[PDB]
PDB file of C-alpha atoms in Angstrom:
ATOM      1  CA  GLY A 750     -31.243  24.304  43.289  1.00  0.00           C
ATOM      2  CA  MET A 751     -32.759  24.139  46.827  1.00  0.00           C
ATOM      3  CA  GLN A 752     -32.667  21.898  49.867  1.00  0.00           C
ATOM      4  CA  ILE A 753     -35.177  20.078  52.136  1.00  0.00           C
ATOM      5  CA  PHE A 754     -35.049  17.779  55.190  1.00  0.00           C
ATOM      6  CA  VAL A 755     -37.016  14.486  55.700  1.00  0.00           C
ATOM      7  CA  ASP A 756     -37.278  13.147  59.298  1.00  0.00           C
ATOM      8  CA  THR A 757     -37.998   9.430  59.842  1.00  0.00           C
ATOM      9  CA  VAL A 758     -37.827   7.110  62.755  1.00  0.00           C
ATOM     10  CA  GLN A 759     -36.566   3.474  62.673  1.00  0.00           C
ATOM     11  CA  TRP A 760     -34.015   1.242  64.430  1.00  0.00           C
ATOM     12  CA  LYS A 761     -30.349   0.482  64.360  1.00  0.00           C
ATOM     13  CA  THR A 762     -28.225  -2.526  65.391  1.00  0.00           C
ATOM     14  CA  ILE A 763     -25.060  -2.204  67.527  1.00  0.00           C
ATOM     15  CA  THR A 764     -23.112  -5.487  67.568  1.00  0.00           C
ATOM     16  CA  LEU A 765     -20.936  -6.187  70.584  1.00  0.00           C
ATOM     17  CA  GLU A 766     -18.338  -8.761  71.586  1.00  0.00           C
ATOM     18  CA  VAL A 767     -18.915  -9.558  75.251  1.00  0.00           C
ATOM     19  CA  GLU A 768     -18.259 -12.223  77.850  1.00  0.00           C
ATOM     20  CA  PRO A 769     -21.081 -13.572  80.029  1.00  0.00           C
ATOM     21  CA  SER A 770     -18.956 -12.496  83.048  1.00  0.00           C
ATOM     22  CA  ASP A 771     -19.225  -8.886  81.841  1.00  0.00           C
ATOM     23  CA  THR A 772     -21.241  -6.530  83.984  1.00  0.00           C
ATOM     24  CA  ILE A 773     -23.985  -4.429  82.447  1.00  0.00           C
ATOM     25  CA  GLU A 774     -21.833  -1.458  83.412  1.00  0.00           C
ATOM     26  CA  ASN A 775     -19.129  -2.818  81.084  1.00  0.00           C
ATOM     27  CA  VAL A 776     -21.560  -3.497  78.363  1.00  0.00           C
ATOM     28  CA  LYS A 777     -22.666   0.096  78.521  1.00  0.00           C
ATOM     29  CA  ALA A 778     -19.008   1.075  78.150  1.00  0.00           C
ATOM     30  CA  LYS A 779     -18.586  -0.966  75.009  1.00  0.00           C
ATOM     31  CA  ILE A 780     -21.787   0.800  73.689  1.00  0.00           C
ATOM     32  CA  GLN A 781     -20.126   4.124  74.523  1.00  0.00           C
ATOM     33  CA  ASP A 782     -16.948   3.312  72.515  1.00  0.00           C
ATOM     34  CA  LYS A 783     -18.958   2.426  69.366  1.00  0.00           C
ATOM     35  CA  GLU A 784     -21.821   5.015  69.536  1.00  0.00           C
ATOM     36  CA  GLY A 785     -20.702   7.919  71.833  1.00  0.00           C
ATOM     37  CA  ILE A 786     -23.653   7.471  74.181  1.00  0.00           C
ATOM     38  CA  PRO A 787     -22.726   8.119  77.777  1.00  0.00           C
ATOM     39  CA  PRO A 788     -23.751   5.147  80.008  1.00  0.00           C
ATOM     40  CA  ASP A 789     -25.937   7.097  82.380  1.00  0.00           C
ATOM     41  CA  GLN A 790     -28.273   7.703  79.416  1.00  0.00           C
ATOM     42  CA  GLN A 791     -28.367   4.082  78.374  1.00  0.00           C
ATOM     43  CA  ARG A 792     -31.440   2.018  79.434  1.00  0.00           C
ATOM     44  CA  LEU A 793     -30.728  -1.642  78.480  1.00  0.00           C
ATOM     45  CA  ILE A 794     -33.807  -3.832  78.353  1.00  0.00           C
ATOM     46  CA  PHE A 795     -34.206  -7.641  78.175  1.00  0.00           C
ATOM     47  CA  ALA A 796     -37.294  -9.717  79.041  1.00  0.00           C
ATOM     48  CA  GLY A 797     -39.355  -6.457  79.503  1.00  0.00           C
ATOM     49  CA  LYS A 798     -37.212  -5.553  82.527  1.00  0.00           C
ATOM     50  CA  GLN A 799     -34.335  -2.998  82.640  1.00  0.00           C
ATOM     51  CA  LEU A 800     -30.973  -4.305  83.672  1.00  0.00           C
ATOM     52  CA  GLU A 801     -29.019  -3.168  86.771  1.00  0.00           C
ATOM     53  CA  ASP A 802     -25.451  -1.872  86.254  1.00  0.00           C
ATOM     54  CA  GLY A 803     -24.270  -4.194  89.062  1.00  0.00           C
ATOM     55  CA  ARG A 804     -25.362  -7.526  87.571  1.00  0.00           C
ATOM     56  CA  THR A 805     -23.750  -9.577  84.880  1.00  0.00           C
ATOM     57  CA  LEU A 806     -25.054 -10.893  81.573  1.00  0.00           C
ATOM     58  CA  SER A 807     -25.020 -14.435  83.032  1.00  0.00           C
ATOM     59  CA  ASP A 808     -27.207 -13.190  85.994  1.00  0.00           C
ATOM     60  CA  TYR A 809     -29.830 -12.325  83.357  1.00  0.00           C
ATOM     61  CA  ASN A 810     -29.160 -15.590  81.458  1.00  0.00           C
ATOM     62  CA  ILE A 811     -28.242 -13.345  78.512  1.00  0.00           C
ATOM     63  CA  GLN A 812     -26.653 -15.743  76.057  1.00  0.00           C
ATOM     64  CA  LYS A 813     -25.025 -16.073  72.668  1.00  0.00           C
ATOM     65  CA  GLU A 814     -26.713 -13.931  69.979  1.00  0.00           C
ATOM     66  CA  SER A 815     -29.118 -12.277  72.453  1.00  0.00           C
ATOM     67  CA  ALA A 816     -31.096  -9.169  71.363  1.00  0.00           C
ATOM     68  CA  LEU A 817     -31.221  -6.352  73.797  1.00  0.00           C
ATOM     69  CA  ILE A 818     -33.131  -3.038  73.316  1.00  0.00           C
ATOM     70  CA  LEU A 819     -31.539   0.350  74.106  1.00  0.00           C
ATOM     71  CA  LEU A 820     -33.556   3.292  75.088  1.00  0.00           C
ATOM     72  CA  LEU A 821     -31.919   6.611  75.799  1.00  0.00           C
ATOM     73  CA  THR A 822     -33.209   8.676  78.867  1.00  0.00           C
ATOM     74  CA  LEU A 823     -31.991  10.728  81.693  1.00  0.00           C
ATOM     75  CA  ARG A 824     -31.884   8.883  85.098  1.00  0.00           C
TER      76      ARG A 824
ATOM     77  CA  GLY B  99     -16.088 -15.234  73.585  1.00  0.00           C
ATOM     78  CA  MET B 100     -19.586 -14.429  72.361  1.00  0.00           C
ATOM     79  CA  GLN B 101     -21.611 -11.805  70.540  1.00  0.00           C
ATOM     80  CA  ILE B 102     -24.777  -9.952  71.435  1.00  0.00           C
ATOM     81  CA  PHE B 103     -26.942  -7.491  69.532  1.00  0.00           C
ATOM     82  CA  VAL B 104     -28.322  -4.231  70.824  1.00  0.00           C
ATOM     83  CA  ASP B 105     -31.313  -2.604  69.004  1.00  0.00           C
ATOM     84  CA  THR B 106     -31.773   1.043  69.433  1.00  0.00           C
ATOM     85  CA  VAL B 107     -34.152   3.694  67.952  1.00  0.00           C
ATOM     86  CA  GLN B 108     -32.748   5.908  65.293  1.00  0.00           C
ATOM     87  CA  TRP B 109     -34.601   9.125  64.439  1.00  0.00           C
ATOM     88  CA  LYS B 110     -32.783  10.347  61.323  1.00  0.00           C
ATOM     89  CA  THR B 111     -32.869  13.628  59.353  1.00  0.00           C
ATOM     90  CA  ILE B 112     -32.140  13.192  55.570  1.00  0.00           C
ATOM     91  CA  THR B 113     -30.931  16.100  53.408  1.00  0.00           C
ATOM     92  CA  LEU B 114     -32.127  16.206  49.786  1.00  0.00           C
ATOM     93  CA  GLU B 115     -31.342  18.493  46.914  1.00  0.00           C
ATOM     94  CA  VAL B 116     -34.527  19.157  44.888  1.00  0.00           C
ATOM     95  CA  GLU B 117     -36.268  21.678  42.620  1.00  0.00           C
ATOM     96  CA  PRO B 118     -39.750  22.921  43.476  1.00  0.00           C
ATOM     97  CA  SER B 119     -40.998  21.519  40.155  1.00  0.00           C
ATOM     98  CA  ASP B 120     -40.102  18.028  41.318  1.00  0.00           C
ATOM     99  CA  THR B 121     -43.081  15.778  42.060  1.00  0.00           C
ATOM    100  CA  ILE B 122     -43.705  14.030  45.357  1.00  0.00           C
ATOM    101  CA  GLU B 123     -43.334  10.854  43.349  1.00  0.00           C
ATOM    102  CA  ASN B 124     -39.879  11.992  42.374  1.00  0.00           C
ATOM    103  CA  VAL B 125     -38.943  13.018  45.910  1.00  0.00           C
ATOM    104  CA  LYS B 126     -39.826   9.479  46.989  1.00  0.00           C
ATOM    105  CA  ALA B 127     -37.463   8.107  44.350  1.00  0.00           C
ATOM    106  CA  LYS B 128     -34.667  10.271  45.838  1.00  0.00           C
ATOM    107  CA  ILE B 129     -35.442   8.900  49.284  1.00  0.00           C
ATOM    108  CA  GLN B 130     -35.102   5.462  47.873  1.00  0.00           C
ATOM    109  CA  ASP B 131     -31.731   6.461  46.330  1.00  0.00           C
ATOM    110  CA  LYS B 132     -30.390   7.539  49.780  1.00  0.00           C
ATOM    111  CA  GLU B 133     -32.060   5.204  52.258  1.00  0.00           C
ATOM    112  CA  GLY B 134     -33.398   2.349  50.244  1.00  0.00           C
ATOM    113  CA  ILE B 135     -37.135   2.553  51.274  1.00  0.00           C
ATOM    114  CA  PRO B 136     -39.316   1.807  48.149  1.00  0.00           C
ATOM    115  CA  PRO B 137     -41.666   4.699  47.298  1.00  0.00           C
ATOM    116  CA  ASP B 138     -44.834   2.576  47.606  1.00  0.00           C
ATOM    117  CA  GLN B 139     -44.111   2.288  51.360  1.00  0.00           C
ATOM    118  CA  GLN B 140     -43.344   6.021  51.767  1.00  0.00           C
ATOM    119  CA  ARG B 141     -45.908   8.387  53.321  1.00  0.00           C
ATOM    120  CA  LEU B 142     -44.637  11.961  53.146  1.00  0.00           C
ATOM    121  CA  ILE B 143     -46.371  14.536  55.505  1.00  0.00           C
ATOM    122  CA  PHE B 144     -45.964  18.270  55.430  1.00  0.00           C
ATOM    123  CA  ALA B 145     -47.966  21.006  57.212  1.00  0.00           C
ATOM    124  CA  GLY B 146     -50.223  18.295  58.638  1.00  0.00           C
ATOM    125  CA  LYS B 147     -51.248  17.072  55.116  1.00  0.00           C
ATOM    126  CA  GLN B 148     -50.177  13.874  53.366  1.00  0.00           C
ATOM    127  CA  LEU B 149     -48.760  14.599  49.929  1.00  0.00           C
ATOM    128  CA  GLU B 150     -50.343  13.016  46.807  1.00  0.00           C
ATOM    129  CA  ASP B 151     -47.730  11.559  44.415  1.00  0.00           C
ATOM    130  CA  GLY B 152     -49.210  13.691  41.652  1.00  0.00           C
ATOM    131  CA  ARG B 153     -48.556  17.168  42.871  1.00  0.00           C
ATOM    132  CA  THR B 154     -45.208  19.069  43.038  1.00  0.00           C
ATOM    133  CA  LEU B 155     -43.345  20.764  45.845  1.00  0.00           C
ATOM    134  CA  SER B 156     -44.489  24.179  44.551  1.00  0.00           C
ATOM    135  CA  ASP B 157     -48.049  22.940  44.732  1.00  0.00           C
ATOM    136  CA  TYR B 158     -47.571  22.312  48.481  1.00  0.00           C
ATOM    137  CA  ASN B 159     -45.728  25.645  49.020  1.00  0.00           C
ATOM    138  CA  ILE B 160     -42.640  23.602  50.087  1.00  0.00           C
ATOM    139  CA  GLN B 161     -39.721  26.004  50.005  1.00  0.00           C
ATOM    140  CA  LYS B 162     -35.997  26.005  50.821  1.00  0.00           C
ATOM    141  CA  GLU B 163     -35.162  24.397  54.113  1.00  0.00           C
ATOM    142  CA  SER B 164     -38.665  22.963  54.473  1.00  0.00           C
ATOM    143  CA  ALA B 165     -39.027  19.878  56.733  1.00  0.00           C
ATOM    144  CA  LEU B 166     -41.023  16.742  55.841  1.00  0.00           C
ATOM    145  CA  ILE B 167     -42.026  13.790  57.947  1.00  0.00           C
ATOM    146  CA  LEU B 168     -41.710  10.286  56.524  1.00  0.00           C
ATOM    147  CA  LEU B 169     -43.891   7.450  57.789  1.00  0.00           C
ATOM    148  CA  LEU B 170     -43.429   3.856  56.596  1.00  0.00           C
ATOM    149  CA  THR B 171     -46.429   1.637  55.924  1.00  0.00           C
ATOM    150  CA  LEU B 172     -46.213  -1.854  54.633  1.00  0.00           C
ATOM    151  CA  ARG B 173     -48.224  -3.851  52.028  1.00  0.00           C
TER     152      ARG B 173
END
């Protein structure tokens, strides 16, 4: 018996319970609890624009069932 | 009290137990067993060459701890 490795790229869905009053900073904290990703490495993207840590979900008119994209980079 | 979804990219490494006599076609079946991608959509790449379903791992000089690249192409 022998062993080989297969690398493939795709996506993954992280589901979060949030309030519209929540700041982006708090949303990144919820992502850290579930996935282990430190917030400074999280780039959250909605409407082709990255979201500031100061603002809230309501500020971006992010509503029920919204789909955000997470890219991981240094900053 | 609301719910939002965060889609993030996952780059995944799959570990398979195989024999060198196993065909590429069989390897794709194992990938289907583990990750659920049907073999018709699997493109396996090793040493810059795409693998024909007919040949075996020994035919491609794929040895212990060899690393393959998987690309997904639809119908």
